Write a protein that binds this ligand. Structure first.
Ligand code: CA
Length: 262
């Protein structure tokens, strides 16, 4: 009885695959054409329906090519996704938060009818790598209307994210030297309220740049999080609770959550 469910019933193998079950088309946004951000690429499922919309920001000196694989993969599970370039490659996290917001507004208002016709504008999510993940936290902390937030190896000088009320999955990299989990990802997760839906997934043997190439674990749990909270799709709770295995032979260095989720 959930009107937001899309696609067949999930399995571990389906979420680890390099494509979800939807064929995908693309629409480009030029730098000049984009107000408030540096342009981007919108990926959308071809199959006629409305879907949640996601904006993804790269990090410092990063371009949309650094998150492109992940944007396309998420879209192939039934989402409209824009991977953005930023106004300049040196923009700081709080600027990237404004550009994430601009990108969502662009998809809803100024993209073509192929895109707008496929977006449920009431179901929006944000993601970002590094300073883009910092921008994800900042925007989520200002925007309780957002349905989900996924900071990937996030970087931010502010360590206190107690005002976030959005369901938030933080992915860290254990060997991160650029945004060390000791002083970024872990304090961020610890400052999120315990009353919200949240999770911390620390990749094993991973550098800061693990999100920038195809990664089955990042893909699987990013999609499961978006399905669970953008679509309210309880078929995906099984992957999040109790979640990935936490050690020898396991998927991840560590996993924490507020399971069970409301
Ligand atoms: Ca622009």
């Amino acid at each position: 009885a959930n009107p937001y469910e899309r696609g067949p019933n999930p399995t571990d193998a389906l979420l680890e695959a390099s494509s979800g079950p939807f064929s995908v088309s693309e629409e480009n946004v030029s730098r000049f054409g984009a107000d408030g951000f540096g342009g981007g690429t919108i990926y959308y499922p071809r199959e006629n329906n409305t879907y949640g919309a996601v904006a993804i920001s790269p990090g410092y000196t990063g371009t949309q090519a650094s998150v492109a694989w992940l944007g396309e993969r998420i879209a192939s599970h039934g989402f409209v996704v824009i991977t953005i370039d930023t106004n300049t490659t040196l923009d700081q996290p709080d600027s990237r938060a404004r550009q994430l917001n601009a990108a969502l507004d662009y998809m809803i208002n100024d993209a073509s009818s192929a895109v707008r016709s496929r977006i449920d504008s009431s179901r929006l999510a944000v993601m970002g790598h590094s300073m883009g993940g910092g921008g994800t936290l900042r925007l989520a902390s200002q925007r309780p209307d957002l349905k989900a937030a996924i900071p990937l190896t996030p970087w931010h000088l502010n360590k206190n994210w107690s005002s976030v009320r959005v369901p938030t999955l933080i992915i860290g990299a254990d060997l991160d030297t650029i945004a060390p989990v000791l002083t970024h990802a872990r304090p961020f997760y610890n400052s999120l309220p315990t009353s919200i839906s949240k999770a911390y997934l620390e990749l094993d043997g991973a550098t800061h740049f693990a999100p920038n190439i195809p990664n089955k674990i990042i893909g699987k749990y990013s999609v499961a999080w978006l399905k669970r909270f953008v679509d309210n799709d309880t078929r995906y709770t099984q992957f999040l609770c109790p979640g990935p295995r936490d050690g020898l032979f396991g998927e991840v260095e560590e996993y924490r959550s507020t399971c069970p989720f409301a």
